């Protein structure tokens, strides 16, 4: 009977502890559901950070492309000048060779 009375008190203690565990788990339900929104926003911001970063890299590639283009413009110009000079040499060379023969003749 006393052991039966003590087990009754123990079972009441277990009940009071399960009331608390039940309620404390419910507290977590709301907390976890709201955590979903927080990580969603963390993802939202990350993707915005990702896109901005891509834009910054693409700008630097634009800058470099402008340099490449300028160098190609200058290369075409120099290759034209070099062809020009080579034609000067060829024309002058022939005139000197021709004049030297006439002098020897």
């Amino acid at each position: 009977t006393t052991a039966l009375q003590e087990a009754l008190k123990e079972k009441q203690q277990h009940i009071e502890q399960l009331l608390a565990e039940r309620d404390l788990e419910r507290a977590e339900v709301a907390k976890a559901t709201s955590h979903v929104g927080e990580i969603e926003q963390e993802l939202a911001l990350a993707r915005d950070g990702h896109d901005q970063h891509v834009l910054e890299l693409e700008a630097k590639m634009d800058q470099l492309r402008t340099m490449v283009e300028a160098a190609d413009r200058e290369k075409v110009e120099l290759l034209n000048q070099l062809e020009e000079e080579k034609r000067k040499v060829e024309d002058l060379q022939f005139r000197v060779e021709e004049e030297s023969i006439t002098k020897g003749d």
């Binding site: 060829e90 024309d91 022939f94 005139r95 060779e97 021709e98 023969i101 006439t102 003749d105």
Partner: protein, 228 residues
């Protein structure tokens, strides 16, 4: 993306009929014609003549950028449809050479590019034959450009073929070697060098009319082309 290519042609002809006008619209049409020329096209069997003669007329446009672009288009038709120029060779060569005296450097450049392709694409025998009277009778600097073309063509033929053409070729070069213009004399030397490289000593009896001094100069350039 169309099957009916004749309709495209008709609209192109229509635009390009606007000589000395509608420069931007006509540039578009010319570039369109250039694009077609690359395409694997049934246009040519039916429209080659019509397109070519309108394009050759367009070489005389008052707008430099139009003349220059028309020569670029001509260049592409030359390298993609050379066989079709059989009956229009004299005309096409003359127009291409004539563009070499344009006052606009861009037009002269486009003509040089066209002339280069013409020499690698047109039947070599026929080209040499067409060039011979031009070399003998055209004004500076058209004769100059003709000699330079002949040189490029000569490098494409066999010894047997060249030997057959040499009686037509030689008179212009002998006469050009006496031309008052230094550039014309030089071009003739260069052309004779290129003959020599093909037929060697066989060239000699063709040169009996040259003075010793002109023989010396030719032998010098022969020796320069052999070395460095």
């Amino acid at each position: 993306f169309s099957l009916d290519h004749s309709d495209l042609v008709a609209e192109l002809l229509k635009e390009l009929s606007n000589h000395n006008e509608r420069v931007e619209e006509r540039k578009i049409a010319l570039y369109e014609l250039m694009k077609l020329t690359q395409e694997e096209f049934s246009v040519w069997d039916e429209h080659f003549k019509t397109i070519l003669l309108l394009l050759l007329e367009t070489l005389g446009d008052k707008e430099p950028t139009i003349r220059a672009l028309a020569l670029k288009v001509l260049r592409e038709i030359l390298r993609h449809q050379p066989a079709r120029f059989k009956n229009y060779a004299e005309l096409t060569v003359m127009k291409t050479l004539e563009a070499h005296k344009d006052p606009h450097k861009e037009v002269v450049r486009s003509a040089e590019e066209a002339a280069s392709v013409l020499a690698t694409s047109i039947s070599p025998e026929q080209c040499i034959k067409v060039l011979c009277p031009i070399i003998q009778t055209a004004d500076y600097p058209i004769n100059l450009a003709a000699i330079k073309m002949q040189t490029k063509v000569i490098e494409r033929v066999s010894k047997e073929t060249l030997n057959l053409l040499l009686p037509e070729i030689m008179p212009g070069l002998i006469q050009g070697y006496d031309n008052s213009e230094s550039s014309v004399r030089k071009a003739c030397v260069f052309c004779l060098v290129a003959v020599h490289a093909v037929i060697g000593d066989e060239l000699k009896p063709h040169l009996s009319q040259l003075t010793g001094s002109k023989m010396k100069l030719l032998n010098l350039y022969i020796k320069r082309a052999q070395t460095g």
